[PDB]
Design a protein around this ligand. Structure first.
Ligand SMILES: Nc1ncnc2c1ncn2[C@@H]1O[C@H](COP(=O)(O)OP(=O)(O)OC[C@H]2O[C@H](O)[C@H](O)[C@@H]2O)[C@@H](O)[C@H]1O
Length: 169
């Protein structure tokens, strides 16, 4: 059931682990079965996790995503799709957290994290915690209280990581 080479993760719960790391570098090191992208409904991979993952695939993720949207239309807020992980992972699970900065319901963050339960092991970011404007501690708490499968969270920002791991969740 895949034993992966995740290294240097702090344990949060039975099934959630966390590390101060760039998700791109973790994916290159581990080559997991599933890397999660913090996507938008249009799969336009501009910045943050999505832009960094896409750049590391030499834009192949974006080209594949454009074909996905042309065939299927936008994802739902809280929804997901499974696409290739290209050189980074077997699969990329593109998951859309709510864009709280655009008035989308923060409750949809739970629906977003539920997608993780369809996969035994994931390398993932904190959904909605960047430009989508959700409180990062809240995103972590929802993750812990929603995901039952094994999730390795990569937190790029050191100061944020230090705050998250010293917080009650
Ligand atoms: N390379 C990285 N590795 C790990 N964590 C990262 C990295 N880059 C950012 N983070 C953290 O990952 C967390 C999420 O930040 P975000 O990636 O903005 O995702 P969202 O769900 O809020 O916004 C999605 C939009 O952003 C994109 O443009 C998409 O195309 C969408 O339009 C934050 O804590 C970041 O510090």
């Amino acid at each position: 059931s895949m034993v992966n080479s995740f290294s240097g993760y702090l344990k949060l719960t039975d099934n959630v682990y966390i590390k101060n790391a760039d998700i791109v570098e973790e994916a290159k090191k581990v080559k997991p079965t599933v890397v999660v992208n913090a996507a938008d409904v249009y799969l336009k991979h501009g910045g943050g996790v999505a832009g960094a993952l896409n750049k590391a695939t030499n834009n192949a993720m974006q080209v594949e995503s454009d074909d996905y949207i042309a065939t299927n239309g936008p994802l739902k807020v809280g929804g997901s799709c499974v696409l290739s992980g290209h050189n980074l992972a077997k699969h990329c699970l593109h998951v859309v957290g709510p864009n709280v900065n655009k008035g989308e319901d923060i409750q949809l963050l739970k629906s977003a994290y539920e997608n993780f339960n369809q996969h035994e092991v994931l390398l993932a970011p904190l959904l909605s915690a960047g430009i989508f404007g959700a409180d990062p501690i809240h995103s972590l708490r929802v993750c812990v209280d929603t995901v039952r499968t094994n999730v390795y969270l990569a937190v790029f920002d050191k100061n944020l990581y230090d705050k998250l791991v010293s917080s009650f969740l």
